[PDB]
Paper text:
A recent groundbreaking study discovered the ancient origins of the cGAS-STING pathway in bacteria, which play a similar role in the immune system to combat bacteriophage infections. Binding of cGG to bacterial STING causes it to oligomerize into long filaments and activates the nicotinamide adenine dinucleotide (NAD)+ cleavage activity of its fused N-terminal Toll/interleukin-1 receptor (TIR) domain. In this study, we demonstrated two distinct mechanisms underlying the regulation of bacterial STINGs and a structural basis for cAA recognition and oligomerization.
To reveal the molecular mechanism underlying cAA recognition by ElSTING, we determined the 2.57 Å and 2.55 Å crystal structures of ligand-free and cAA-bound form of ElSTING, respectively, which forms canonical V-shaped dimer conformations. CDN binding will induce the closure of the β-strand lids of CgSTING and ElSTING in nearly perpendicular directions. These structural differences result from the direction of rigid-body rotation upon ligand binding: with one protomer superimposed, the other ElSTING protomer rotated clockwise by ~26°, in contrast to the anti-clockwise rotation of CgSTING by ~21°.
Author numbering:
A (entry chain A), B (entry chain A): 5 to 78, 87 to 165
Write the structure that this text describes.
């Protein structure tokens, strides 16, 4: 039943169009220079939200502000400068994940406040399936395997 | 049953992260100047492939070469210079559509040649659902409604 789920296609998209694009970009730099600091290497921490919403970008904004992570653009990413020495510690919360609630909220009637028993069980399985798929793809590729970790909010 | 389909989340992604990004970029230009030619306005033709594959980018490459469309980068897009006067006629075949076969081919056994009766009926409904969702989103927004058409291969 996995491979038909939206959370599979969303983790493939995110892995190919974002994770892969950003490791290659950072490995293509003669030297990694972020706000005047040269780093040998980077970790990329992908934060899986504990709960799903149409506006994951707004959730992300609140989470990185809560956590005092500053913005580094290459497109744009978050670095914890305080806790990053020779290894730059970068973060993303995947905003693509909002398209699950957006697709559900689309093709529905306007009023609905909250989520059916069926809907909450869906987001749960979709969040965990996205995390598994994304970890699998990271680990099967020498270009991502060591440089990218998937962690909970 | 629509809103759970991957083809819904893929058309929302494509609409927000690509269609919307490119209309805004082309409307933000003091003048639209592509290979030395000033255009008043543009159409964006989104080509829906007649058949689904993991490698839609390879299908696209063959289709634009077949059709003599040259590459215009802003990120990158196709223009039919011959058939575009004051209105620039731009094209994309959405490569994101490959993630349907990629997700299916993932979580499966290595050997499989071709597609089950169940699988071919799936791609069919997913292609048509992607086209409907994408047309709906284009038409409900004054920033895309007039500038973007969805056509068959």
């Amino acid at each position: 039943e996995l491979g038909l789920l939206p959370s599979t296609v969303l983790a493939i998209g995110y892995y190919e169009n974002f994770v892969s694009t950003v490791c290659d970009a950072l490995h293509s730099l003669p030297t990694i220079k972020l706000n005047g600091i040269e780093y040998k290497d980077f970790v990329f921490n992908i934060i899986i939200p504990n709960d799903l919403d149409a506006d994951i970008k707004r959730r992300a904004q609140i989470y990185f502000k809560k956590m005092d992570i500053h913005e580094v653009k290459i497109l744009y990413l978050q670095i914890d400068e305080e806790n990053s020495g020779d290894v730059a510690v970068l973060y993303d919360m995947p905003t693509t994940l909002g398209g699950i609630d957006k697709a559900i909220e689309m093709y529905m009637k306007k009023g609905h406040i909250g989520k059916t028993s069926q809907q909450q069980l869906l987001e749960e399985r979709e969040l965990r399936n996205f995390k598994t798929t994304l970890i699998n793809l990271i680990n099967n590729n020498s270009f991502t395997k060591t440089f990218v970790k998937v962690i909970e909010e």
